Amino acid sequence: IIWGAYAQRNTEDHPPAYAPGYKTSVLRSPKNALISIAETLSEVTAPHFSADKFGPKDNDLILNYAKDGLPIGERVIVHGYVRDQFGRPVKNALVEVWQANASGRYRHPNDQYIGAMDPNFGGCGRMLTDDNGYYVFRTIKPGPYPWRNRINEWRPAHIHFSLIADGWAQRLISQFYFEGDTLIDSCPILKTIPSEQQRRALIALEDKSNFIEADSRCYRFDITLRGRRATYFENDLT
Amino acid sequence: IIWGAYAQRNTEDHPPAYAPGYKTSVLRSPKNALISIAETLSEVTAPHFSADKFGPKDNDLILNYAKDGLPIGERVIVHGYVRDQFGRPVKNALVEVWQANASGRYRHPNDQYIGAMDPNFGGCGRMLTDDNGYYVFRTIKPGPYPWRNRINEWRPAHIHFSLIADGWAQRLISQFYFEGDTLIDSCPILKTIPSEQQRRALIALEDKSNFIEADSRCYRFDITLRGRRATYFENDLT
Amino acid sequence: IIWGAYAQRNTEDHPPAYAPGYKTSVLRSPKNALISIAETLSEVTAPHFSADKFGPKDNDLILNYAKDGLPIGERVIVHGYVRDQFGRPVKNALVEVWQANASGRYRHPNDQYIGAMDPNFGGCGRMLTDDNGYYVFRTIKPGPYPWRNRINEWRPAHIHFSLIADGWAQRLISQFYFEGDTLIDSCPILKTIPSEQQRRALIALEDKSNFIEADSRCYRFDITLRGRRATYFENDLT
Amino acid sequence: IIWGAYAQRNTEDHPPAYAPGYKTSVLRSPKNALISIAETLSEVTAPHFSADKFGPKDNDLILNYAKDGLPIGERVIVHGYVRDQFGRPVKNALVEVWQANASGRYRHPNDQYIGAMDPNFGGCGRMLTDDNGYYVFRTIKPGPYPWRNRINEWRPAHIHFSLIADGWAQRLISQFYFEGDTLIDSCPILKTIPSEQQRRALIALEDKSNFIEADSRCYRFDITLRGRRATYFENDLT
Amino acid sequence: IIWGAYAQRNTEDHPPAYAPGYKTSVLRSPKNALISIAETLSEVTAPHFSADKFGPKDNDLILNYAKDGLPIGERVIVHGYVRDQFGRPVKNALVEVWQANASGRYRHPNDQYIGAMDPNFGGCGRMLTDDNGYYVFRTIKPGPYPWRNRINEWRPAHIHFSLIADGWAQRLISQFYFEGDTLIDSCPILKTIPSEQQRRALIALEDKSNFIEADSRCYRFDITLRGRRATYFENDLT
Amino acid sequence: ELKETPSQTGGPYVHIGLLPKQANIEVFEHNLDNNLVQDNTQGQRIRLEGQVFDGLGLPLRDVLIEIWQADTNGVYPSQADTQGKQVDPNFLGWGRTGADFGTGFWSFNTIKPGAVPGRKGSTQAPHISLIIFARGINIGLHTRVYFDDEAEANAKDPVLNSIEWATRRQTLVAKREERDGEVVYRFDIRIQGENETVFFDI
Amino acid sequence: ELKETPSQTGGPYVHIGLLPKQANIEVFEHNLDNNLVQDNTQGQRIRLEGQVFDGLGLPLRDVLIEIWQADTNGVYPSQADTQGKQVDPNFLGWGRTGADFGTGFWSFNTIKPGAVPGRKGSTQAPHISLIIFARGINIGLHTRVYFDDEAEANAKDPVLNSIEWATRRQTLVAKREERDGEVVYRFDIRIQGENETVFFDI
Amino acid sequence: ELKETPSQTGGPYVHIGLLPKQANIEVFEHNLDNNLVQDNTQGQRIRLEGQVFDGLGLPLRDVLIEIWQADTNGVYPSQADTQGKQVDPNFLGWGRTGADFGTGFWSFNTIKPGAVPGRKGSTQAPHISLIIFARGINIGLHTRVYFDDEAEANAKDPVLNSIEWATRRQTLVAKREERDGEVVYRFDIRIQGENETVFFDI
Amino acid sequence: ELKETPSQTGGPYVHIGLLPKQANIEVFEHNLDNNLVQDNTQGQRIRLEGQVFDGLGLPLRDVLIEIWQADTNGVYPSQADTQGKQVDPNFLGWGRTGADFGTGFWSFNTIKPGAVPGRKGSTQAPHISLIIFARGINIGLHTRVYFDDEAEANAKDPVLNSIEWATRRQTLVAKREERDGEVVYRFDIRIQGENETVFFDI
Ligand SMILES: [Fe+3]
Ligand SMILES: [Fe+3]
Ligand SMILES: [Fe+3]
Ligand SMILES: [Fe+3]
């Protein structure tokens, strides 16, 4: 199989750059349209991260920063599969996450929210998907938190995630939420996404059969990246 | 107005004593039917609790036990009204609550759940409703937690509440949950309640307009107790 | 009761500043997002207008400017209640109105519309709501009128109204229309409002039982202003 | 992959122990609730049965007991797949079946039903699923038969089946029926199962494309056993 | 796995031999019923075509006959999978196609249609499916064309295809159409097929994500051939 | 008309959340307990104690018990009391307690209640209303405690006589005992099985 | 809970219907104006004036302006003021005006406001709340006017510091000028474009 | 995710269809039985026998019983066993039997199992997993058989201690007896009523 | 076919969660940074630095930047590179960084990339692919950095020539400077307004 270029990103399945509902976007969105280009090796290539560099607890946010004891909060496991738009599993892709603690507080002097800090929680993790595009990490369920869009704006609970896979064109950063969270319906950031079906694509589903008794709950969340088309005739990529 | 007896408790709006789905009930439920009695002063009377005894932080679970700092978790305010079945407000009724911390852990050596303990959280509060039957307390949103009914049983997040009002016949203890919590649909305890409408009567609703910016979220939850009928003819209560 | 701040204005229930359909808004709308601020005494306070200053006919647009005779047009009474978003009546709020005459002509040399002027009609009135937030004024039903948005643009019949209540944050100016007016469906100004339910919130309803025989018809129109939340814990307003 | 424990058996997808509709269960059902335990090696292990022990006709109920000629009745082939609740095929699991003959008569002096005995039919078979969890046996379609629950009770046609797979926790015995059999709707035993969807899970479907011309009809029937969860963090099984 | 015979062809999923709507069939359809036979090696066997014989451009109808330049018309890629009725991929099956050019004109002195001939288009191609039953060829989208059934009869655009796979019983010739073509609804030939679902089974679907930018559009079209049943008991094929 | 809020079990921690002090959770300065006797309270002091057994005969160690009673003159310290008589000003009439995590015994230090008026000019024998809360109990179980030394009054008691199974009436009568100088009434509650205690729907 | 009545533009005649007197419509005996200074009002009198420009740089001649401010001691003549301090009895704190149909200038005769308490024990620099209504403006635009001679206080002002773009803070600071003996603060409002005035959602 | 195939009773002929040989149905050359002891099997041979009684105290004569156990060293002849220890090569660990149509007694000839690792580094007392199938039993009933001569180990057994009703733990302990030279463990199963055997949901 | 997971802003903490080390969160032993130069890396070292400005001309101090480039010979350290040439074994080609919370400058220590093959036998001028993430940016913004000392090559570059507004092509060309002995390429990114940097949809 000789691979061609990645399928075109469907701009309609993504939030526009200018979304007045999300205020900060008003001054950080280009006024000019994005210039689409035909892909070259620069776009279809991406870096490789060796597993040797990853620590044993990089994907365990419950323990990778616990000092005296355990972080306070809901013990949850999150797993899922990373596939490309054509169903192919994405192997050895770097998945990085960051989140707030159970109070909705981020570990940084910038975050002045009254929600309490947890001395045993960092809020950062990372992993490499396996040969089946499978990923799994453990953490504390992040709490929602206020922010100033409109003075009383509140982000539903969420975990920020980033992916670097096989092609630079696949580079993606997003946020996933937890099923049932009522703040999901009122979030200006989540509402920057045009379709209802795409909004729901960011909701991790409770995976009850995979709860670990007397220990942790589990959420299932799958991620889909852009995929490459195969070439059977002219190969103009080069 | 000369008050008569409390209206009959509608057994169909309550869980039966025997509910095999909730295992512990199998041996702690009478096999004989409850004997209904006509009410006397013993049933229509109840104790009075003076406000003088209540401390300034009895209804603030965020601060009534904070030692070094604040408890870890989601800052939430819960308020609502207590009325009798005929819409009349219940004045000066003692409302007592108890709950787990953000990890789903209760402050007691009995609870051996791995969920972490919070040194700054007690989990107990109490208040007296005002002349409008209104009540309000602040706390940390309790986290769900495992228990052994079936090894992998999990209680949705909840706050236990108790009420002592005007009549002993109104004595009631129950639990309320939070809107959107997916564990609500699978709970054997909540499912001991026959009707779907009564199950929903125990769900606190997100009250977004009453969220306090950059501080706390709010839930609205109303409680209904049995009411007394007025007597306009014979008064056989005595 | 110690009052806190006014609930956040729900920007989605109001027209955006930029509405290209209403041409004049293109150059009179900020390009920057509104900066939301936490409220202070400056925002929760407002002026008081003593009833002593109001004349006996200030709320009677049929007679407050009649010189030789009565104004030509449909005799209508308009009343309703002003409440805050939580149902509380707004007491002693200044309600000011202004409108065109029966021809759709405003009393000013600027208005050059061929619709005839009425020497006995002014088109201005004002009142203070009572302790129940109730208000009532009498006038002539204003006629629709052309304007230049698109050369053949026509405003449905309307009465402009303004309110100064308890808090500066409640300051509001708007327009209400009359039930059944077909121009309502085509108005670019009314269509600046996003939801259909909010558009209908500006339509005065025919109140047939309150028509005064052989005299005047009546319309019912209620107004809702932002409301204050009560504070039961920290009071950071000051 | 390090395997953990089997997912919890969902008691709601199975008949309760006490089912008064099925009379014999009244005295053979514990009055105490089942005690759920966390799994150990005892529960996740199970015996292995070597294929060497199985005879060439163990899965052919038409010939494994034919003496003088062939058994009387409908020649049918039954096949399907055995998977765990997560879709994984169950390999080399012992599947044992037993049934009545075409008259609804079981080969045993206990069965005194007037339905005629077949000298060339035994009614017992067994097999091991392959690497794909696939199984296939041939037999005579069993006839329905009367039994005494209520004097005129009749079991729809059925084949009893048993499975011993990878874990003792998967041990399961049940009965499957044939699509279209009208007795299915009136069976007290089948009705011990709570949900309609689970009842239908026991109905073998006519597999017309797999009928063997001028020979035998075919039914498709899949079986689902409990599955094990994988462990990626603490492995407390040991 | 010991293979048995091919499943019976379902005559109801195919057009009958006699279809008066398609005139030419009136004299070229047997009046006697087809005699069904039990299969032998003659029916389950078929020829093998080595890939060595196929030229590099046999599956590229755009270039396999271009002399001076490129053929005129819509550049389209057509791909899909060939499976048997049980989902198994058909490997190394000979797929041959033939079609008209962009004018609806076939390259042959017989075709006297005024639609213009294309000196750089042949209209013939062939390929062998891979191990996944996948096939792919490139061509010019054929134009519809008139024919005499009823003087004004028009065939929707189509590509004729033929398949020789593993068994002679699978021999099949048909035609596929392009999604959206309005002539599809009026074609007497396509309407010889009884069911609407089978008619739609001959429509190639626009595969937008597989369009090649600034080059060619793509259509997805899957083909299903009859499948063989496996034998686990008597093998009378021989 | 609204429906009553549905009951739910107090859960495994009800005897902890409603008696924080005794669980070493010092959040309240003034804590509610099982001592209804104040220095100026009138009437003869008595100790009410017993155990609650499940269907196996095992004492529950996670039960929460509350009692409601009238003062020494049969008057309830409640605004709902319409007897027109003054109530003992130093009596709450209510108390709450749990069982010892080990022994399983629960108890209250109170006063023996005076007779209270029944319906239609009748007179009720002295009694104490008691309610049981605990894990596995979906709705608080109501019952009454009568005293065996009040045989004459119990015989004419309306509620006791409303129980048609005369044999079950005795499950509501506590036994008087005297440990040195203190009067103790033993009252064991059996939720299920033989001699199952009578429970009321009040 | 109810939703707020939706806003609508004041329209081309808002500065006429809300200031009838100045449009030669004498319907009211007592008319509201842009003069907040009464003979006994305390504080130093000042004149607040400026213009409102659209996205083209053209002054709006159909704008209606209102201001809300505290007295000379930073107390609002409002029952909602919880400072426990007495307010200037001769000060309404509110005023309304339009722009001259020709020049386009608007103005108010008022007093310079005293500092008002901010949230959490903070102190706000002296300011005047101002709102803009007009044709093409769907919702009244809120803004604040601070004074340039109060540099020290403005630097510590909570609202001004909540504006992360320090460069826009200056659009809220009026400039002091002295015409003979009168103190004038020039404050121009730019609705769109460069140096667009900051607008608040209060 | 799929749901587990719903259980159904084995029916009145389960002990016949799963033990054809003993019902005079010679279809299989190699038949499964209740003898887990092979000539080279290690460990001390023991006989496990008892009866199964219904709610009336009557022995079931149509019950089918199977047991699962580890070898003499506490290792299961299963690929799922992760102890890294070798298992007795001459031990199936599983057996099946029915009750005598007359007496009602069932039995197995096996070896006494060695201790097996419990969860979290714990150690389970020697036990045999047993399951009951029969007419009237909708789902196979799981239970365990412990040995009375292992008092010390049973006391520390995790599963036995997970049973909060200490009085029911004994229903899982079989009694050792010695008929001449053979060691026999009597284990009676009571499905309903007094001394009802503990059943697990594994 | 599935749809791509919808993008969302990295949020106000993206430059903290993806660079924990620099936010004093020591969770990882091996941390990713903005240094693509290893001791054995080939090519001439260069420093790439600049700032990102919003629509007001203010530098973003919460932006996260990543770059992707080929080695000194124009070969990508990626399995997707089909040039058949060997890549510098000591070069990751990728780097990540944030801006200084004060100054607002971001930078990378890397090598100047060699020319990479373009589509249809063409040749691309040396470039570095760069992506911008930050609060207010809903989808990572893609752009390229070309070098001004490569005028000859940039003129024939396919991507640069695909931009029909020749005047915008220059926003993608960084300027070479030499601080003492080090070669520095200044590249400022303007998200909105005049001289708005060209952004690609790749
Ligand atoms: Fe609880
Ligand atoms: Fe108007
Ligand atoms: Fe049967
Ligand atoms: Fe966040």
Question: Can you give keywords for this protein?
Answer:
part of a larger assembly; 9 chains; A: 238 residues; Protocatechuate 3,4-Dioxygenase, subunit A; nine-stranded mixed sheet; two-stranded antiparallel ribbon; 2 helices; F: 202 residues; mainly beta; 13 strands; binds fe (iii) ion
If you had to describe this structure to a student in words, what would you say it looks like?
Chains F, G, H, I: Pathway: Aromatic compound metabolism; beta-ketoadipate pathway; 3-carboxy-cis,cis-muconate from 3,4-dihydroxybenzoate: step 1/1. Chains F, G, H, I: The enzyme is an oligomer of 12 copies of the alpha and beta chains. Chains F, G, H, I: Keywords: Aromatic hydrocarbons catabolism, Dioxygenase, Iron, Oxidoreductase. Chain A has 238 residues and is mainly β. Chain A has one domain (1-238): Aromatic compound dioxygenase (Protocatechuate 3,4-Dioxygenase, subunit A, Sandwich), CATH 2.60.130.10. Chain A is built from two helices and 14 strands; from the N terminus they run E-E-H-E-E-E-E-E-E-E-E-H-E-E-E-E. Chain A has helices spanning 41-44, 196-200; strands at 2-6, 35-36, 75-84, 94-98, 124-128, 134-140, 145-147, 153-155, 158-164, 172-178, 203-206, 217-220, 223-225, 228-231. In chain A, strands 3, 4, 5, 6, 9, 10, 11, 12 and 13 form a nine-stranded mixed beta sheet that branches. A two-stranded antiparallel ribbon of chain A has the order 1-14. Chain A starts with a strand and ends in a 7-residue tail after the last strand. Chain F is mostly beta strands and 202 residues long. Chain F has a single domain (1-202), classed as Aromatic compound dioxygenase (Protocatechuate 3,4-Dioxygenase, subunit A), CATH 2.60.130.10. Chain F contains four helices and 13 strands. Chain F has helices spanning 14-17, 151-155, 158-162, 166-169, and strands at residues 45-50, 52-53, 63-68, 94-98, 106-111, 116-117, 123-124, 127-134, 141-147, 173-179, 182-186, 189-190, 200-201. In chain F, the strands form three sheets. Chain F has an eight-stranded mixed beta sheet, with no helix packed on it. In chain F, strands 2-12 form a two-stranded parallel ribbon. The radius of gyration of chain F is 17 Å and the shape is globular. Chains B and F meet through strand 2, helix 1, strand 4, strand 5 and strand 9 of B and helix 1, strand 6, strand 8, helix 3 and strand 13 of F. The structure holds fe (iii) ion (4 copies). Residues 155, 158, 160 of chain A line the site of one fe (iii) ion (FE).
